[PDB]
Amino acid sequence: GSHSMRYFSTSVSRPGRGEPRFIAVGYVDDTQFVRFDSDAASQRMEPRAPWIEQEGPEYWDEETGKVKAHSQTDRENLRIALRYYNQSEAGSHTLQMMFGCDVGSDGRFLRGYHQYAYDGKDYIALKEDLRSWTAADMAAQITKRKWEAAHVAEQQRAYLEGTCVDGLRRYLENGKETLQRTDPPKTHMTHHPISDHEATLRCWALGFYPAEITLTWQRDGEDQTQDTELVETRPAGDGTFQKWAAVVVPSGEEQRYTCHVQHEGLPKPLTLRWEP
Amino acid sequence: TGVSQDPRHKITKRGQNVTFRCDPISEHNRLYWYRQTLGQGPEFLTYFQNEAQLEKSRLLSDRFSAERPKGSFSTLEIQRTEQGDSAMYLCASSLHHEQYFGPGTRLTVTEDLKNVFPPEVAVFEPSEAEISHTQKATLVCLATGFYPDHVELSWWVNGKEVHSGVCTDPQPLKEQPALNDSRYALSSRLRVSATFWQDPRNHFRCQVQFYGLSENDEWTQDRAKPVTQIVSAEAWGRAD
Amino acid sequence: EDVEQSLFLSVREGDSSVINCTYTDSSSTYLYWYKQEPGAGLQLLTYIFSNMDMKQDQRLTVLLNKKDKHLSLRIADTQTGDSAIYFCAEPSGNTGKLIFGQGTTLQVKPIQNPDPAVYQLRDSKSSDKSVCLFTDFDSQTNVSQSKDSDVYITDKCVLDMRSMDFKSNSAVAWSNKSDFACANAFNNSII
């Protein structure tokens, strides 16, 4: 069903060591297609996927112009945040921004996003209705009243329902092989004795796309969210993802435990039990 | 009506420098300068995001220089003015996307300050023929031989400005419409009831506000210095 | 590549005036109508975002066709006070700086039954100087220019007397020369 496009941008002020560093990356679902690094030699929006390289010359000149303008504005926004929080300009701070759009199976606009965080905390977020803002703190209330007075939401909504979705539809047709695919997880169990009395069962999911996945543990059909360990979903480095979950288990009790895997690429959710 | 520009009108000798000021709406982060020639759309000169000047056009040559030192107010400086520089210089501000424009700085660049003249103003009384046929009376006001064309014509009836029964030509017409430094003329009509015109207690004053030289401008000619002034002409009712 | 609108639109008082405008980039998320009166500055009249078909405010209607890059302004029940220059404006590049059409001068014509006359008006200050007033003529009258460089003729001017509901077209002629009669002053065709 749903496809998404996201831009993630980080501004980091380094007072002394020059102007703030700005990094932006674009994703369609869990595939990167571009990057900009203010500190790099090129000074350009760069391709980061083989399928995006067939975008014409004007694409690259326009996206470069627009990401350098984004650079300037988020540079100014760090200085405004200093005022609002009455912080010294000796300190290093992080402004993070995430925006983009979703389309359904039918190719219709589903969802828009436009969110900021200031040194790792929610600052302001465009609501799901795309008509109003969520301010997480007292500084963000100032921004919110400014933005409601200037009709910033109405203007962003036109971008999100316009150029954002138009971009996403085009990428989905030009990167079809990579983006409109599911790779099901290859699953298995490992068993690691850790004592006379204790053992670790590890449930594995390798080589799946997209990255969205659920690994859950049960003990005789009861949810085991206890002595349980879930690693972050990690890239394989080749367009696919990996994950494991583990439970530490009294010796002899292995057969009572089940790993349950959900992924779009599986017809039915798997159950796995230790029995090699 | 939140964006301020100073000065409203300016006259300078060609080859001199001039500075304009723009005061944006209180808290507006984005500020834009545009040039407008009569007949035509404004053309972008430059753009400020707070203190940072992020974009200039090729219109902005070496001679043109904008600053916005503290955000807040902005100034545009022209060095060694040419006659091609004569134009309205507009300022706009916004919080985000909505741009609010000021009233502009109307620049006139002239070879010599002796080319500047206040208006002469005459009031022309209604015809008996018009009153007989239409039971209406038209007064015409005629402002002639002024340069530059920075005038505001108003009608005053028993000491009070009238906002109805008035037509002023939208543009002055040149006494030599082909020449570059021609003097200007401007006409206005006030139309009232025959009965109002026929009461000789009624007083009609045509007023022309002229924008000329500042009182610090050099002046060595013998005729009065053509400073900013009001020239008027008047008629009384005629019981005829 | 420019914002194109027509330079001039004539409409009759009470009719609907449509002003058309083609803009440059589909990626533009808003489009403005500014209005300029003879003296005053740019008034922000109305706007529309690229994801709306149509917007209404009093007598003003905006229609947007994003596909063709066509924007239009509809004035219902056009009054003589709607006479002004209408500029469409679109954001250009990444700064929100505006590019402007050349602007449409809207001339609204009174519907008053014409009663054309030329009057001579005498200087108020004890002089021998005069003007000619050509007044109350049809709104379709082309008042043509003087052959003579020492005879000055203004444009057609619309005067509104509100207490009566009375609009009239007027033009003024004058000359310094002696042999200037009001009889010969105004060449005009009714087009």
């Binding site: 831009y7 996206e63 627009k66 990401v67 303008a69 984004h70 504005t73 988020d74 100014e76 926004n77 405004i80 945040a81 609002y84 925006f99 900021y116 600052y123 302001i124 921004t143 933005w147 200037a150 910033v152 203007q155 962003q156 971008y159 150029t163 954002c164 138009d166 971009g167 085009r170 | 982060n29 984005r30 995001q49 919080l95 985000h96 996307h97 | 990626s27 533009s28 998320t29 954001p91 590049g93 990444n94 929100g96």
Partner: peptide, 9 residues
């Protein structure tokens, strides 16, 4: 495809 305008806090 990036937007052509970003808001100031």
């Amino acid at each position: 495809q990036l937007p052509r305008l970003f808001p100031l806090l």
